[PDB]
Design a protein around this ligand. Sequence first.
Ligand SMILES: [Ca+2]
Lengths: 52, 346
Amino acid sequence: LYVSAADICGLFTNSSGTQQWRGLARYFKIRLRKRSVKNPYPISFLLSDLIN
Amino acid sequence: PKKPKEPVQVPKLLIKGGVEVLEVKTGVDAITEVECFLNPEMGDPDENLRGFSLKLSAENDFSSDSPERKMLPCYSTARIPLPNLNEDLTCGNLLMWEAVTVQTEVIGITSMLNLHAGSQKVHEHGGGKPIQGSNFHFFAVGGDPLEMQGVLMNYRTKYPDGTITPKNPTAQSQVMNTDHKAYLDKNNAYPVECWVPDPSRNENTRYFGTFTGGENVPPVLHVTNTATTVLLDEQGVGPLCKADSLYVSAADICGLFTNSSGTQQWRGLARYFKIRLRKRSVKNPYPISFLLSDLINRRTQRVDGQPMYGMESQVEEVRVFDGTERLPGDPDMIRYIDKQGQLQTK
Ligand SMILES: [Ca+2]
């Protein structure tokens, strides 16, 4: 399960004025289940990768 | 009014286009026709002079012969990636592509009528000397790479680094030598003067070629879109594409181009190909224990144990017991199977 994020939350300005970024962490709550799918790759695809 | 007669059922074109068209999910009885070409690899001595070779070294010594890479014509080769026939066959059947029919042609044959192009003056006030000399026209179509044979002359020739050559030639290499087997696995490397296709090992390709060697012979070239070469064997099968790949090879030396100073160099032309494909039901010749043996041998750790196989093996006796028999009087007996039947020494 591939989870990716990018949270830039503005510019922190220092005492001398020198700005710099600031980010915060991001929570994830993924609800999964078991999906019945069809086998895409039989042993004909699988034998032919040995010859590959 | 009067309706015309019903037109004859021809095969239905689904999509014409480039190489991206092969990906279409079609039925079982689909047929494709791949049209392609190969450029000759004649040496190309600079960027302005594609299709020619470098000028020929005239009289090298037989012992100290050392040619250069730009004057050796090489074989052309190419692999055409085919998509997989992803099906759901039973009892170990598959589908593979089959090269049914090739239809080849040399592209550019009337370019040799250019006589005002730095060719040698044919007589005192004549035109230009046309391209003529030793010519070789080859093409090979198969589902495997072109397996060839290293047979040359003058084994003491010092070839350059770019050309791949027969390894360690002897005097036996000037005739048939079984040690010089190789594939055609690289474009513009294998020179024509060292490598002939192997008559003993091209079980899956169909290679066709002719050679005519003379000081001045006519290059006779025919150009036609109705000629048709059938690639089927005695059993009615063509080149099967084991890996989903179609291998196309060629070599077209047309002759020697004599310059105005009298200095000769080669000339090559391209070669059109038109392979007609179909889908063949074959069987799986291999058991399931080749799939699983390759899965295990890349997930189990490699153990550097003591030798348990070979000439320094440490397995001393293996005995196989199957079924019951009456008690034999010799416990130190020796039993095996020789060629077909169970034999029993002492
Ligand atoms: Ca053979």
